[PDB]
């Protein structure tokens, strides 16, 4: 998918998690976030096209998605156990992780 579409999947699905009142909604949203994160992890963000795959930035980019997917999977396991509000709480850190680890690599150039 387009990098923008994957980015917007992580943004818009957090709202679907926050407003949910049943487990199904939370898992559906977490499952879309997971697929978006794994797809974006395969991409080369535009500011990194000059860089080798073994550069610290590329490794930093790829592994920031590993942090995000790990946290998505923790929330997802709670939702599969029917713990909606625990899953919703655990999903709040996803925005922090997204800003701290991924955002900077989407700046233009």
């Amino acid at each position: 998918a387009d990098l923008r579409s994957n980015w917007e999947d992580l943004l818009f699905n957090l709202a679907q998690i926050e407003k949910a009142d049943n487990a199904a909604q939370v898992k559906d949203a977490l499952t879309k976030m997971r697929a978006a994160a794994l797809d974006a992890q395969k991409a080369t963000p535009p500011k990194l096209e000059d860089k080798s795959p073994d550069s610290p930035e590329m490794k930093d980019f790829r592994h920031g998605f590993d942090i995000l997917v790990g946290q998505i999977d923790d929330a997802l396991k709670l939702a599969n156990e029917g713990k909606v509000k625990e899953a919703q709480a655990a999903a709040e850190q996803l925005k922090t992780t997204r800003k701290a680890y991924i955002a900077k690599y989407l700046a233009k150039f």
Partner: antibody, heavy 132, light 109 residues
Framework: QVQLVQSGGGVVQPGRSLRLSCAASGFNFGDFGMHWVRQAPGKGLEWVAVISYEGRNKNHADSVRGRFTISRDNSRNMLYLQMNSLRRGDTAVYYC?????????????????????????WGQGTTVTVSS | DIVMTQSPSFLSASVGDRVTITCRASQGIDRYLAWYQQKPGSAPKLLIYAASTLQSGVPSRFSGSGSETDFTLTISSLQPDDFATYYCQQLSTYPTITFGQGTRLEIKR
């Protein structure tokens, strides 16, 4: 000229439905998120809905969720608001509005450039009156 | 959802006055706050975004500031064109957006 021209609206009875349209011109419509905002008689602005540049992601306010559905057709530069199960409390002028991009950015740069910087271009407004 | 509270709701001023309008967020929103102007019978007009950035074409006498949860809009010296209603808008919770309730600025006599 960057502009949004709205059509539709009018008097509609409770529990029935209506579709608002918003025709865009003078810019790359499919590069921007789009919003609906409403204003009841004598009251403030109330945010209604947003849709992503592609039409794949959307969100609606608690007060309209499950009854209103935002959508778009990029090949015709059209934005829509489908309103079902109308209630008298939905009486308002409805505005469509284009998401603003921060001026230091010519193209999409995720949260540096989009989403968080208001709405720069507004339609002229469509009146909806819900009454029996 | 986040509540934006504008103060005062109504205020009077004369041409040439310095005018300050405040908005207060129920929780932190960093700088993701925009200000709008609306006159009766017309659409809102974006004045300021990111709390302090002046939208192009907006006269330089408008200015904004604030962080986290306290924000103000200032008009250094009023013109007749500035009597209107002003709304703040938080976008930190995007794609959930909320507006302040508005502040009407009227001519004193």
């Amino acid at each position: 000229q960057v502009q949004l021209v709205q059509s539709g609206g009018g008097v509609v009875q409770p529990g029935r439905s209506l579709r608002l349209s918003c025709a865009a011109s003078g810019f790359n419509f499919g590069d921007f998120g789009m919003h609906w905002v409403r204003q009841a008689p004598g009251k403030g602005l109330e945010w209604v809905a947003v849709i992503s540049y592609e039409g794949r992601n959307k969100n609606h306010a608690d007060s309209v969720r499950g009854r209103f559905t935002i959508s778009r057709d990029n090949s015709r530069n059209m934005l829509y608001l489908q309103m079902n199960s109308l209630r008298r409390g939905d009486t308002a002028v409805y505005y469509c509005a284009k998401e603003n991009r921060d001026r230091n950015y010519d193209s999409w740069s995720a949260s540096y450039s989009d989403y968080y910087y208001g709405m720069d271009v507004w339609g002229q407004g469509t009146t909806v009156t819900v009454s029996s | 959802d986040i509540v934006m509270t504008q103060s005062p709701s109504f205020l009077s001023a004369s041409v040439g006055d310095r005018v300050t309008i405040t908005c207060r967020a129920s929780q932190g929103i960093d700088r993701y706050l925009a200000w709008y102007q609306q006159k009766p019978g017309s659409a809102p007009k974006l004045l300021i975004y990111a709390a302090s950035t002046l939208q192009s074409g907006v006269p330089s006498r408008f200015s904004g500031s604030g962080s986290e949860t306290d924000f103000t809009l200032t008009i250094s010296s009023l013109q007749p064109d500035d009597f209107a209603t002003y709304y703040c808008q938080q976008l930190s919770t995007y794609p959930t957006i909320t507006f302040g309730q508005g502040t009407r600025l009227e001519i004193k006599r």
